[PDB]
Write a protein that binds this ligand. Structure first.
Ligand SMILES: Cc1cc2nc3c(=O)[nH]c(=O)nc-3n(C[C@H](O)[C@H](O)[C@H](O)COP(=O)(O)O)c2cc1C
Ligand code: SF4
Ligand code: SF4
Ligand code: SF4
Ligand code: FES
Ligand code: FES
Ligand SMILES: [K+]
Lengths: 432, 214, 263, 45
């Protein structure tokens, strides 16, 4: 009735069986691994059944939102209105520490296109625009090879999978931006204009790409969608805590012996995951200083929090952080925490699209202030000023990049203020 | 300098000779046909990228020529070129060297890789070699963070880099030999160095764990 | 029958569905502070000063773009809104140049006046300000682009009321600059109007540049005679001399614009 | 045909070209069904 000891998943329930590219990633290998099997029956079941089984799965947005993917995808169950319906798969993967999208695309692309096909059918979309980032040129070419194989096999195109539905997938390359990862900015960049995000009184379900309805979904979420249809929401709901189901991927990087990727069951203990899959923190677990749970946007937590925390949405939310993209970055006692965070703010300043004032001016201001903090040329009152500034841009920006840049500062301040104090005192008496 | 105001120069002038090869033209029209009719302006980013491939760097003439074929006003084309980072508004030298400097890849001593390139090339961060072979600049996160410090040579990822390993890569480019894309270590793509902690069993065939219904 | 009902500061207001929060607040009389939102041009959202607190709602909404619905109490003077306005202006005045004594907008600058009403009384920005090279767009428009706040009012005006697409925004981040990239004069019969819409002294008039101050000129309404449209103008006279011909508002004849030959 | 889990068979990306992505995109065009028409030829027309 309850699998309290969540984690230690087995190979049978793993989705991306070809994660490390140890099997044929072409159509032949994907069909061998169990892809494109009874797809027509999924198509013939009807979009309501596809949406309904997603709610039973309790799938949450694996892109940094954690939204109830079933509820979100239900927004195009509305009848047709003359305008075409479009699906969009986010594949930017610009958040630091995030590598999962790269691996699925270049090692199991056929799952992705099938995900667009079943996803489009559920939401009634006409075509899927996979927005792969510009850097992933080899990945994009690998993705297109699978698309051509699917087109020749008759899985996609006119009468997709022999079910009457006509679905097409256009893989659109990026031109280099982290803000393109944002859903509305991605919708913007597809349209050909500058990649600034658009405000939302409206929503992509009503007004979106070319003005037609759209829904930006992460690569992982759509990729696991067909297997959810095959194995059921009940099978998917079995894993993970309540409201925390599924087997989210994990990108472990930083001061680990063997940084890697693993598709571990959700709500896994953080210590357990690092110990076996990654190999443990360099210099032993006691050498840990701080950990980035789910990417740069997610605030850091110290080792004391790291002692026992389940890797999921709710457990991290009560731990003053978020799951985000499950990008676990560890930082040992040899890591300059202030320098590392300042680099993250530097990245955010170099990636802000400059549209709204709080993100255009606040992030740059926070960059300059944090630069002084690294050198120590400041005063203790500046820490509080940095806190107020980070709150001023929080929730006042068009997209969640401003909140995505304010959280690391808030995370650093509330957990390493004595380190900041010591550095400033060190600067003070040195320059006497 | 990354300046966003183009001042006319003999090298980069609106009369600079640029056009599209016929093979590029059929590629362009296929790009435009991917988008719905009436919104052909959406092809600005891929088409402008096409001009980059056959020119290395795009001058103002390339950005104007993209405007004519796509009917987009030149100002909007200028917006896209300056906003996105990849578009080289200034000439670059053959192999473009991009080094990640974000925290996840810097935590594993990425500056050692940057220092190694600096020593072998002799070119300081930002400029280009006199023979126009390497253009060393730093870049933000490129996704491959679980892999060790890496580079983005031209259009290839070289992960799990090590200061001597990039020395081999540079001389291979200097001699014309292409370095193999992928990590420069035992790890193939992203697997743990010690061994496969998961997916050690043959994947189950079609129909496994499949409900009765569908 | 379609009129939905909202509570601007608690007082009930009848609003046509689809009405933005900003217009609903204007119905009572409260004018939400704004930079990017110009009534004639489209709505953008770069301003971020139109932010207001909706009752029992945790996120401050942008009144320039949010359409109201049933039973909303737009708390204009709520504390959270006031903190938001101070924060947004603090960012605006962070990199603004100290040109008030030498800026023509001095005395009629929206940034100046909104600082007096909705803004702090000091600065906590102990950094180095940014500077942006000037651009030339013709012998009519003063362009000190360092004072610009990227409200994109000029961009919207050029692409909507002028029809020519030569003003845009180049680059990202704080280094983003609004201009025309390649040097080119922004020339149209309505070119001089970008002086009026610009809330700061970034775009001002070269012929009148720093010859008078707004608080010392006497404004006299009149009718333009250069063209047959008969646009209503406000001729500003000081010490028996004519410096500026500003457009008036009529909503039928000239809306809020005049031709360059008129100005 | 084994469980050759010690081989990374995804090596096709090594021998790719500058124009590879746009090349097989063009070859893939014939499969694509006609795009929807928004009426006018451009948002400005
Ligand atoms: C600055 C920023 C960057 C983002 N980058 C990505 C990204 O690279 N991939 C992604 O899937 N979602 C990204 N998101 C989240 C999207 O905006 C959106 O919420 C999500 O893609 C929706 O799909 P999902 O529900 O499957 O996550 C980003 C958001 C922000 C604010
Ligand atoms: S938060 Fe930054 S990236 Fe997002 S819309 Fe505002 S300025 Fe652009
Ligand atoms: S634009 Fe306004 S704030 Fe800026 S210098 Fe002129 S008067 Fe002062
Ligand atoms: S120049 Fe004036 S109108 Fe144009 S964006 Fe800057 S402040 Fe706004
Ligand atoms: S951290 Fe080096 S690539 Fe993202
Ligand atoms: S008024 Fe709505 S953002 Fe400027
Ligand atoms: K002005």
């Amino acid at each position: 009735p309850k699998k309290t000891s969540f984690g230690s998943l087995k190979d049978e329930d793993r989705i991306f069986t070809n994660l490390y590219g140890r099997h044929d990633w072409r159509l032949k290998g994907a069909q061998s691994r169990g892809d494109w099997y009874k797809t027509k029956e999924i198509l013939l079941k009807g979009p309501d059944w596809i949406l309904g089984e997603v709610k039973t799965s309790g799938l949450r947005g694996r892109g940094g939102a954690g939204f109830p993917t079933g509820l979100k995808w239900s927004f195009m169950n509305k009848p047709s209105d003359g305008r075409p319906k479009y699906l969009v798969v986010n594949a930017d993967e610009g958040e630091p520490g995030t590598c999962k999208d790269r691996e699925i695309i270049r090692h199991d692309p056929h799952k992705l296109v099938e995900g667009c096909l079943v996803g489009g059918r559920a939401m009634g979309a006409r075509a899927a625009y996979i927005y792969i980032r510009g850097e992933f040129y080899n990945e994009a070419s690998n993705l297109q090879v699978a698309i051509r194989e699917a087109y020749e096999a008759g899985l996609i195109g006119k009468n997709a999978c022999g079910s009457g539905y006509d679905f097409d997938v256009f893989v659109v390359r990026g031109a280099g931006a982290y803000i393109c990862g944002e859903e509305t900015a991605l919708i913007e960049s597809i349209e050909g204009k500058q990649g600034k995000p658009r405000l939302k009184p409206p929503f992509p379900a009503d007004v979106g790409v070319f003005g037609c309805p759209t829904t930006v979904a992460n690569v992982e979420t759509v990729a696991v969608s067909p297997t959810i249809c095959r194995r059921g929401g009940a099978w998917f709901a079995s894993f993970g805590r309540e409201r925390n189901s599924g087997t989210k991927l994990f990108n472990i990087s930083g001061h680990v012996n063997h940084p890697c990727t693993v598709e571990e069951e959700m709500s896994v203990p953080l210590k357990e995951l690092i110990e076996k899959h990654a190999g443990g923190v360099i210099g032993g677990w006691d050498n840990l200083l701080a950990v980035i749970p789910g990417g740069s946007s997610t605030p850091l937590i110290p080792k004391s929090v790291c002692e026992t925390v389940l890797m999921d949405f709710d457990a991290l939310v009560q731990a003053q952080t978020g799951l985000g993209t499950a990008a676990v970055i560890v930082m040992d006692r040899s890591t300059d925490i202030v320098k590392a965070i300042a680099r993250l703010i530097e990245f955010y300043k170099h990636e802000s699209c400059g549209q709204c004032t709080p993100c255009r001016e606040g992030v740059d201001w926070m960059n300059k202030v944090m630069a002084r903090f690294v050198k120590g040329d400041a005063r203790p009152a500046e820490i509080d000023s940095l806190w107020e500034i980070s709150k001023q841009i929080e929730g006042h920006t068009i997209c969640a990049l401003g909140d995505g840049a304010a959280w690391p500062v808030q995370g650093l301040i509330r957990h390493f203020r004595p380190e900041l104090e010591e550095r400033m005192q060190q600067f003070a008496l040195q320059h006497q | 300098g990354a300046l966003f105001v183009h001042r006319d120069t003999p090298e980069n002038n609106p009369d600079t000779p640029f056009d599209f090869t016929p093979e590029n033209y059929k590629r362009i029209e296929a790009i435009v046909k991917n988008y719905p009719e009436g919104h052909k302006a959406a092809a600005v980013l891929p088409v402008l990228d096409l001009a980059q491939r056959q020119n290395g760097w795009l001058p103002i003439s390339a950005m104007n020529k993209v405007a004519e074929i796509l009917q987009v006003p030149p100002m909007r084309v200028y917006e896209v070129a300056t906003f996105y980072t990849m578009y080289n508004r200034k000439p670059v030298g053959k192999y473009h060297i991009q080094v990640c400097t974000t925290t996840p890849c810097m935590l594993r001593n990425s500056d050692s890789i940057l220092e190694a390139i600096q020593k072998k090339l002799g070119i300081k961060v930002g400029e280009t070699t006199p023979d126009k072979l390497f253009t060393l600049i730093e870049v933000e996160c490129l996704g491959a963070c679980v892999n060790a410090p890496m580079v983005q040579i031209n259009d290839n990822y070289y992960e799990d880099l090590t200061p001597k390993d990039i020395e081999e890569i540079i001389d291979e480019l200097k001699a014309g030999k292409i370095p193999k894309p992928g990590p420069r270590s035992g790890r193939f793509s992203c697997e743990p160095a010690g061994g496969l902690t998961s997916l050690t069993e043959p994947p189950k065939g079609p129909g496994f764990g499949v409900q009765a219904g569908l | 029958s379609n009129l939905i009902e909202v509570f601007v500061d608690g007082q009930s207001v009848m609003v046509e569905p689809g009405t933005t929060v900003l217009q609903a607040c204007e119905k009572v009389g409260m004018q939400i502070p704004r930079f990017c939102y110009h009534e004639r041009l489209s709505v953008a959202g770069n301003c971020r000063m139109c932010l207001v607190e909706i009752e029992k709602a945790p996120k401050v909404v942008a009144a320039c773009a949010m359409p109201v619905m049933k039973g909303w109490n737009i708390l204009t003077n709520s504390e959270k809104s006031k903190k938001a306005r101070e924060g947004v202006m603090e960012f605006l005045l962070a990199n603004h140049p100290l040109d008030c004594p030498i800026c023509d907008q001095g005395g009629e600058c929206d940034l100046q006046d909104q600082s007096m009403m909705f803004g702090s009384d000091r600065s906590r920005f102990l950094e180095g300000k940014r500077a942006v090279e000037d651009k030339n767009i013709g012998p009519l428009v003063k362009t000190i682009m360092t004072r610009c706040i990227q409200c994109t009012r000029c961009i919207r005006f050029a692409s909507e009321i002028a029809g020519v697409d030569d003003l845009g925004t180049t680059g990202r981040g704080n280094d983003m600059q609004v201009g025309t990239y390649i040097e080119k004069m922004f020339m149209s019969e309505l070119s001089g109007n970008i002086i009026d819409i610009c809330p700061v002294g970034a775009l001002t008039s070269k012929p009148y540049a720093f010859t008078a101050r707004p608080w010392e000129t006497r404004k006299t309404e009149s009718i333009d005679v250069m063209d047959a449209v008969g646009s209503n103008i406000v001729v500003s006279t000081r010490t028996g001399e004519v410096m500026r011909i500003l457009p008036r508002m009529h909503e039928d004849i000239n809306e809020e614009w005049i031709s360059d030959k008129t100005r | 045909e084994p469980f050759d889990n010690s081989t990374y068979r995804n090596l096709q990306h090594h021998e790719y070209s500058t124009y590879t992505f746009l090349d097989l995109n063009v070859e893939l065009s014939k499969f694509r069904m006609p795009q929807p028409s928004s009426g006018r030829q451009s948002p400005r027309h």
